[PDB]
């Protein structure tokens, strides 16, 4: 089969900058003067969206800042000026022969100014404590870059092995990320302590920000 | 406007069979040049697996050939995907897509929403919804969707009326083998008394739909 390889695998570009994505096919996809290379844009949770067909034709409804070029085995997708809503994974696809194959995808992220997270801590609900399990959630809202460190402290005791982190995809509205850290304890272990703290360290934060609460207060 | 709506996803046993349907509305299925199925698995990009043209000619990807059948029902304006002898590698989000009458045909401008097929021997389990009450300016609140299987869970706020500031985090796999996620939203503190906030949780594999109101403790 024809294998497609894209480059780079991912990129982080400043907003408004020009973006170039290349796709190399293991065999030529030319046929009768046309090149059967297509490009797709896939945003989180959505189906792929057709941008370019036949190497250089712009699909109706797609902004004119997207353009394609190339022939034979080498093809290029160009974004003349990267916009915040262009955060997505981009795929090339050859339609020269079956099976119709896709590239591995190129993730495009917008590089914006450094922003500090808004930290919030949530105690476990009384509805959950009735089941015998406690979940303490710490929220880091709207920050950049994606790199953020979170560590828990239960009565000044650093926690380890009892938390999990989840990061959202880049928000096109402001090019920021959000992170949640969930500290999972048993109800008995939760009732034996008082202070539950969430310590957040980030580039946009000079000193680490700590938010905490007291159980039963 | 042409719409492709998929159904039939969910949990399947290893060695079992899946049956997906793609109901087409606002467009006659007999008018499309071809109707296709394309699956997306993590680390595998996108893979075309089956097609059927307007005259009934079928074609399949050799990586699945022998255990796949694509069919059509013009009276119901629906085409189907049938796969048997399922393996864990068949776990993916399955899309239906329409081919083109132009420029080599086998590029896809219209897609369905995608449905997740999970090939596992584990059992389905409904989630528990717990509130993340706000502390009392911008306030943060949310819902905790804990212990469910398999994916996915969809979360909206106020039946879709509230979208601004919403962050639904990707699910994480707990050590118990069950998934868990949370969805938050930033709201003004002055609105905590007067504005009602309800998270709409839906877990179709377990037929569990919950509307949970979040208010200060």
Residue numbers in the entry:
A (entry chain L): 1 to 217
B (entry chain H): 1 to 136, 142 to 222
Give sentences copied directly from the paper behind this entry.
Immunoglobulin E (IgE) plays a central role in the allergic response, in which cross-linking of allergen by Fc∊RI-bound IgE triggers mast cell and basophil degranulation and the release of inflammatory mediators. Omalizumab is a clinically approved anti-IgE monoclonal antibody that binds to free IgE, also with high affinity, preventing its interaction with Fc∊RI. Instead, the Fab alone selectively crystallized in different crystal forms, but their structures revealed intermolecular Fab/Fab interactions that were clearly strong enough to disrupt the Fab/IgE-Fc complexes. Mutations were therefore designed to disrupt two recurring packing interactions observed in the omalizumab Fab crystal structures without interfering with the ability of the omalizumab Fab to recognize IgE-Fc; this led to the successful crystallization and subsequent structure determination of the Fab/IgE-Fc complex.
